[PDB]
Amino acid sequence: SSGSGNFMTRMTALLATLFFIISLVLGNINSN
Amino acid sequence: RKVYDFMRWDYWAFGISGLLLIAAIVIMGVRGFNWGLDFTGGTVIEITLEKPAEIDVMRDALQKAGFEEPMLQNFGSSHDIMVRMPPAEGETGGQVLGSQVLKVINESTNQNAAVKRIEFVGPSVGADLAQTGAMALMAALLSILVYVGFRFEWRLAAGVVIALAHDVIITLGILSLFHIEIDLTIVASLMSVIGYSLNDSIVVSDRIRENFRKIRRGTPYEIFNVSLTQTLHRTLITSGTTLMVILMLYLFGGPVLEGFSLTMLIGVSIGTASSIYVASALALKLGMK
Amino acid sequence: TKGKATVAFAREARTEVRKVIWPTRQETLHTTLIVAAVTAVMSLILWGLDGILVRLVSFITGLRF
Amino acid sequence: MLNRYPLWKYVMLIVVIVIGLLYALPNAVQQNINILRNRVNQLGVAEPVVQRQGADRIVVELPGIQDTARAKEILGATATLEFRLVNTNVDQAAAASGRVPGDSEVKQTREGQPVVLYKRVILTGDHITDSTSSQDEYNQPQVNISLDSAGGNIMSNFTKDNIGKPMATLFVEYKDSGKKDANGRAVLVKQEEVINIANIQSRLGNSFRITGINNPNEARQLSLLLRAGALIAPIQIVEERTIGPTLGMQNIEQGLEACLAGLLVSILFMIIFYKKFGLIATSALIANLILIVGIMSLLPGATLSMPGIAGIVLTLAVAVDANVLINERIKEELSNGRTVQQAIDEGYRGAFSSIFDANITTLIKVIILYAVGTGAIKGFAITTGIGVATSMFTAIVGTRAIVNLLYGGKRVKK
Amino acid sequence: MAKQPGLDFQSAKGGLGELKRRLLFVIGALIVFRIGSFIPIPGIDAAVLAKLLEQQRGTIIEMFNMFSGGALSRASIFALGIMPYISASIIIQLLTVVHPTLAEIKKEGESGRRKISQYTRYGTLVLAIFQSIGIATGLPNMPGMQGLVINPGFAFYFTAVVSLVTGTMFLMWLGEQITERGIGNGISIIIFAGIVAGLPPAIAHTIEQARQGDLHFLVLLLVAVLVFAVTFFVVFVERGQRRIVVNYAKRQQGRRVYAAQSTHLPLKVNMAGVIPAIFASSIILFPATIASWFGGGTGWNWLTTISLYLQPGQPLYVLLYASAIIFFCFFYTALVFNPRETADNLKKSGAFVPGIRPGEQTAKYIDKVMTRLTLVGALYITFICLIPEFMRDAMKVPFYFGGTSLLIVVVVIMDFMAQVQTLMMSSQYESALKKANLKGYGR
Amino acid sequence: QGKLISVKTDVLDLTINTRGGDVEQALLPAYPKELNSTQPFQLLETSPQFIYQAQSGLTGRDGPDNPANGPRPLYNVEKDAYVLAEGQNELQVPMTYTDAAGNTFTKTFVLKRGDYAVNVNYNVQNAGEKPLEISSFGQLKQSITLPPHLTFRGAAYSTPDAAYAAYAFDTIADNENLNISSKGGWVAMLQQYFATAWIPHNDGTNNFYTANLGNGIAAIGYKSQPVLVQPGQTGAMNSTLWVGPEIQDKMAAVAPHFISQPLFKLLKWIHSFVGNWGFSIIIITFIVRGIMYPLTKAQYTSMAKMRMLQPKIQAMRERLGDDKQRISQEMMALYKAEKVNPLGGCFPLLIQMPIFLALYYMLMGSVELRQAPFALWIHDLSAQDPYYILPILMGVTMFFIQKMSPTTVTDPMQQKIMTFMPVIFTVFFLWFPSGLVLYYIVSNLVTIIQQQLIY
C-alpha cells in the first residue's frame, strides 16, 4: 500500500469494481 | 512524520502571486464586475441546444423580441446555453403576453432546442438587491475580522483576512473577465465558504495562544513556528469533509449550478493554499520588535 | 556497449545446457500425467469459479447485443 | 467504557436512524423503450440513453425544460403501420441505417432523403409478428421482418408485380404546429418516416427483407427496434432522473439530492481516513439532522427555495467538520505528548474550544447576513440559523465518546 | 504528474473475528480480472471484430493481444491488460542502467539500498491514460466505428477510457489487498491476476456471449477446439523441469509439520532463468507495441519505412532477445536483484534426499543442477527457458497470441501452487520467511 | 521512376507520366497566369508538397491500375512528345501495358481540336486466352490547399436521377467515403474558374467513392460494372476526362442519358454572438487557465521535488510479507509530513488535457484565423511560412514557465520530465499557423504574471 494512509474497505471496493458490467453496458439492462 | 520544508519559498511565492491579484482588480475596473439578475437588474433566457444545431435561428427569435447583438451576453456549460442582457424596455418587459416570438423554441428541423426558463428584474428593484447584497457581503467579513482580533490576536486577524481573501480576489478576477453574474447566490457562496477554511486558522491560533500563555522566560516567535509544524497535517485533513459535500453539489448541479459550485469548490480550498502559514509569518514579522 | 563484445558467456552456455540435458532421459508418461494434472485442475478451478459469475452475465449480452 | 452512551440508549438511537431512512425516499412496455427513445430527441439531447423506473414506467425527460405535461401524448404517439411503394433515388439513406456508426440528434434530424415516388399501399395495420437478423450469404449480416399469415397472403398475391420496387417501413414524423403560440405542443403525423427502405425480392410471403447492416458484431438492438416500432401501443413518459423538467424547481431537487449525496460521501471520508469501530464516530451528526428536520416541521411557516438548500449545505458543513475537529484533536494531542492519566477530563476542558469557535464564527455571519441582506440571503440564513444553534449544543455534549474512543488502545505515537 | 494517497488497503486488526476469508483474496483477484476482461465496454460498438474491408473496423496485431489479455472479439473494461504495468516496469527499472555511479540499485559496501516500492504501482497510473486514448483513437480505422475520447456527450469511448483508468485503479488495489489473509507480493501477484484471461477454451475467453442462443457461428472460434496444443505448450515448460517428487512427508521428511501425505508437486529447478528473460524481452517488445498500440495506416497496417522496421518486427526482435539475454544475466542480475530463494520455500513435497538416505542425491536427479543454482557460474539458467518460448512461437499457438506473456503466467502457477499448500498453517502459526526475492541470479 | 512526355494542341497542353500511364500535369495555353505574361495557367500538378491529378484505368483483381496496389506499372508509349496541328482533327496517345499472363491493356487519351474534354478509351485485348472480368475505373486526387507560387476548392458528384452535391476543402479533419450506386453520372473536382471530372460513358451501374489518400489529400472516383471479356476477344469501355472551365452543365450535356462537434461547439457557445474570431479563443483560454489556478501549479510542482532521499521513498511493501495484525495501524503511522512523488496517480495530469486538446483541435482546422480581429495588434494569424518571430518566442515562453524554483539535480529518474518540454514543443509547433502558436503564449500568460512584471 501507500505510506500516506487511507482505507478502501473491501466489500464496497469489489462492488464498485464489478459495477461497470451491470450498469453502463448497453442491451444488458436496457436496449437503445 | 516530522520535518516540513516549504515556508521560506511559500511567502515569497505568495508575493509573486500578488501581481495576479493586481491583474484581477485591473480586470474588475477595465472590463467591469457589476452584472446580474438579483444584481442590478437583468433579463435572462436559458435554453438547451444541441451542439451542431443552428444558433442563428435562436438569434432570430431574440432579434424579434428586440434584443441586440452586443447586448446579448453569452454563457454555456455542457448542454445548456444561458444568455443575459440589460433590463427589458418600457411596456415590452420579459414576461409579456402576446407576440409569440420566443414561443418558437421547442419545435425544430435543425436548430434542435428547448426552453428552460425566462427571467426579468427591473432596474431600481435590482438595485436594492445589489446594494444590500454588497452590504451583506462586507459586514459579515468585517464581523469575522473583529472576532479573530478579540478572540486571539489582531496582528494574526489581519494576516488571516489578507491571506484567505487573496485567492478569493484572484479567482473573482478570472470570473470578472468572463462576465459572470454576481447574484445573491454569489454573495451567499462568498459568505458560505469563509469558515471551512479559517477553521484551519482557528486550531493553529488556539495552539499558538495556549503555547504562548504557558511559557515563562523563553521567546514567543520560535514557539509560533513549532505551533505550525505541530498542527500542519490537521489543517490538511480538516475541511476535507466539507470539500466532499461541495463535490457532490458540483456533480448533480452540473451546468446550471456550476459557478455556484466553483466558488464553493475554490472557497473551501483557500485555507491550505495561501493559508495560515503565510498569515502567521507576517504577524510574526510584525510581533518581533 | 552491450553489442558484440564481452566474452566468455554465450557459447559456454549452449554446451552447458546440452550437457545438463545429457545424463538423463527427458520424458516419462506418468510424470507428464502429474504435471498435466495439476495444470488441468488449476484451469478447471478457475472455470467453475467464473461459470457462476461472468458466464451468466454474458448470456444476456449474447442474447441482447 | 469506550462508548459514553448507555447501552439501551445507543440501541435506541441505532433503531431510530435505521427506521428513519425509510421515510419519503421510496418510489412488453420496457422492450419498446428504444423506439420511444428516438422520439425524445430533437430538444437538445446530448446523450439519449433510455431507462425504466418500473416495469411499465419509463424515465428519460431532459434537464430543466419548460412544461412537458402538454407533450405526453404527442411524444407517446404511434404509427398507422401503412407500408407502400416509394422510390429512393441514388442515396438509399434511411433513419435506422443512419443510426449504425452510432447516432446523434441533429445528424438524426437531418437524417433521411427525398422520395421521388411515394404511393401505392401494399400492407396496412397490424401485420408483423417478428424481426430478427441472421448471417445470410451476402458476407454482411441481414435483418428480416416476419409477417403474419393474412399479411403474408397479401404480399404473396401481389409478389410478382412488386418484385424490385422500393418498399417503405414507415413510422411517425414530426410537423410544425398550426398556431405557433406556445412551446412543445405540435402533433405528429403517423406514417411519414422512412425508417428503412428496402426492395421486394422474397418468394416467401411471411418473410420480408430489410437492408443488411454494417455493425461490427452487434445486431440485436437494431433487430429489436423494428418490431418495437410496430408492436408498441403508446407509452406516456413519467418520473425524473433527479434532473428533469422545470429549471428553478429542478435546482431545488438537484441541490437536495446533493445534500444527501454530500452527507453520504462525508461519511465515506470518516470510514476512509479513520479506524472503524461501532457507530460512535457517526452518532452526533445523525441526531443533529433529526433535530433540524424536527424543528422545521414544527415550524412550517416559510417556503422552500435553493437559497434554503444552500443553508442546508452550510448547516451540513458545520456538522461534518465539527465531527472532524474533535477526532483529529484527541489523537494528535495524544501523539504530541498531551496527558494520558488525566486525559478524558482535559479532553473535556480543551478538546471542544475550536468546535465552539467554528460554530460562533458561523453564527455571527448568519446573524449579520439576516439583518442586512435581501431576498436569497434571508432564505439562506433562516434555514441555517436553527441548524447552527442546534448543531453547537448537539456537538459539545454529543461528540464526547470520541475523546475515550481515541485515548484507548496502544499508547504509541499516532 | 504524481500523487501518493488513494489506492489503498482495507482497515483490519487481531482477536476472534474474521476467520472465513481463507483463499478469498489470493484467487479472487484472478476471478475479478476475468469478469472485466470478458465483458464489453460501454457503447454502441464494443463487441468489435476486425475488418474485411478497407474503410472501417480495426485489425488484429499480436502486440496488443499479449499484453491486453484480449484481442478483437470485444473491447473489455480491463483491456489495458499488463501493458502499462510492464511499460512502467521498463521505465522505472530498465532505463536507469546508465552510469553505475549515479545509476543506484546496485550493491553498496554498505548494507541495503531499497527505495522503489511505490514506483511500479503509481507508474501504471501515468501511462494508463495516454495508453487508453492511444488504443481508443488507434488502429487503421478506429477499433470499431468513430468515438473520440473528449466528447461531453456521445461519450461512450470516453466511458471506456474512464472505465480502463478507474479499472487500473482497482487492478492495482487487488495487488496489495492480500495482506489481511492472503499470500504473495511484488510483481508476481499482478501477473497471476493479469494474463489469466485464457487457458480453458484454449483462446483468451468469450465463448461467453458469442455461442449463446440463436447466434450461428463466429469464424475466430474455429481455433478454440485445440486446447491440447495450448496445454502441450504449457506442459512443455513443465516438462523441462527436473521431475523430482519422491517418498513421504511424514515425521522428519515433512515440509509441513504433522503431515500424513506428501504434496505431488515436482521441485521446479529452471525458475531462476525467468527473472532476466522477461526484462530482456519486454524492452524489445515495447517500441513495436507502442507502434502497434498507437498503430495506424490507410485501409491497412502502416508499412512505410520506420513502421516496417517495427510492426511485422517479431521474428528478428525475438532473436535480438535470445542474444541480448547474456547482458542481463552477466554483469547485472546478482548485482541488481537478490540471489535468495533457490528451493527452500518452493519445495512443499517431502524427502530431503531422494530415497531418504545419507548423502547420494545424484547428478541425474537434483545435485549437479543444485550446485550451479548457488555456486559461482550462471551459464545454465536463462537458456533452458528460451527452448520452450522458441517451440511455442515457431509454430504459434491457438491462444490468439504467443510471446513471453505465455512464459510468465505459467511460472507464477508453479509458484502459487507451492504457496497454497501450507497457507492455513502459516496463517495459523509463524513461518520464518515469506517470498519476495524470486531467486534473482546471474554472473 | 518512369518519364514525363509533352502533349500539345490549341487550347490544351498535357504532360503524361509513363509510371502508371497517367496525366499528372496539364496546363491551359489560352489563359495566362498573370497580366502581360506568356506563361499558361497550371491545372494538374504532381511535384512534392501538393498533388492534383486524374488517374486513368481498369481495376479488379488482375486489373493493372487498381488503387489498392503498390506502385502503378511502367506503361510504354512509343513517343517522347506529341503535337497536334492541321490535317487531323484528333490526336491519340496510347499508353500500353501487358500484364504477366500476356493480356494487352491500352489506355488511349484522345484530344480533338478546340475542346477541353479529353476522351479516354480503355481497351483490354485478351491475348493470354482465358476468362476476364475487368472493371473501368477513375480516380481524381487533390491536395487540401494550395500556397501561392506564381476556399472555392472541393469535390462534386452528379447523377441524372438525383441533385448535384458538392463539398469544399475547408472542413476535412476526417471525411465521408461515399457508397453511391448509380447508372450514368460523373464525379468532379472544383476550383476557381476551372474543374476536372470523370464522365464515364459506360453502360450499367457505377460505384462511386471518395476517400482521403493521406493527410490533407482528398480523392473522388468511380468503378464501373465488370466487363466480361472472352479468350481471343478485344473489349472496350469509354470515359471523357475534362481539363478546363468550371461549366457543370457541360458534363451532363456530354454524358449518356470521427472528429465530431460537441466540445468544440460548447467552447463556441461561451462567446457566440461576439463575432471577433481569434480574440474569443485566447480570452476564454485565460479564463479556463484561471479556473486551473491551483491545478496548473499542481501539475508543475508534482514534477518538482520528486525525492526525499533514501529513507523517505521506500514504503509499505516489505512489511506486508510479515502478515502481523498491526499492519493497518502502521500504514496510518508512516508518512505525515512526507509526500513522495512516484511518477503518476492520474489526477494532476488528467483534468486539464481535453479543454487544451479541444483548443488545439479547433485552432488546427480553423476557418476563423482568416481575418484580423480589430482589438488584437497582430494581423495574419493563418501565417505558417519559415523565418518568423512567433515560434522562437514560444520556445522561450515554454522555457520560462518551467523556470522559477525548478531545483535541479543529476539523478537519472524524472528530472528531464521538466526540461524535455520546450525541446518537443518548439519543433512540433514550428509547423502550422501563428494563431496556434499565439494560443500557447496566452495559455502560458497566466503563469507569466505570477513570474514577473508584464502588461
Author numbering:
A (entry chain G): 509 to 540
B (entry chain F): 14 to 302
C (entry chain E): 444 to 508
D (entry chain D): 1 to 27, 226 to 612
E (entry chain Y): 1 to 443
F (entry chain C): 57 to 206, 217 to 323, 335 to 532
How does the study describe this entry?
The hetero-trimeric Sec protein-conducting channel translocates integral inner membrane proteins and secretory proteins into or across the membrane. The SecYEG core-translocon forms a central pore through which hydrophilic polypeptides are transported, otherwise closed by a girdle of hydrophobic residues and a short helix (plug)8. YidC is required to facilitate this passage from the lateral gate and for the subsequent folding and assembly of inner membrane-proteins and complexes. The ancillary sub-complex comprising SecD and SecF stimulates protein translocation through SecYEG8 assisted by the transmembrane proton-motive force (PMF).
Subsequently, cryo-EM 2D class-averages were aligned against the RCT reconstruction to generate a cryo-EM volume. 3D maximum likelihood refinement using 53,648 particles yielded a low-resolution (14 Å) structure (‘gold-standard’ method and Fourier shell correlation (FSC) criterion 0.14322, Supplementary Fig. S4c,d) with dimensions of 11.4 nm × 10.6 nm × 9.2 nm. Therefore, we placed an E. coli homology model of SecYEG and the E. coli YidC structure as rigid bodies into the respective EM density of the HTL. A homology model of the SecDF sub-complex was placed as a rigid body into the remaining density, with the exception of the SecD P1-domain. Best fit of P1 was achieved independently from the transmembrane part and the SecF periplasmic domain (P4), by rotation of ~120°. The quasi-atomic model corresponding to 75% of HTL was flexibly-fitted into the map employing the molecular dynamics flexible-fitting method and NAMD2.10, coupling the Cα-chain to the map. Importantly, in the HTL the three periplasmic domains of SecD, SecF and YidC adopt a ring-like arrangement, wherein the SecD P1-head and YidC P1 are positioned at the exit site of the SecY translocation channel. Close-by the SecY lateral gate, density attributed to the conserved TM domain of YidC extends to YidC P1-domain. In the inner membrane leaflet, towards the cytoplasmic face of the HTL, there is an inter-connecting density between YidC and SecY, highlighting an interaction. The horseshoe-shape arrangement of the TM-domains of the HTL encloses the central cavity within the protein complex, which is occupied by phospholipids as evidenced by our SANS analyses. We propose that it provides an adaptable, protected environment for membrane-protein insertion, folding and controlled release into the inner membrane.
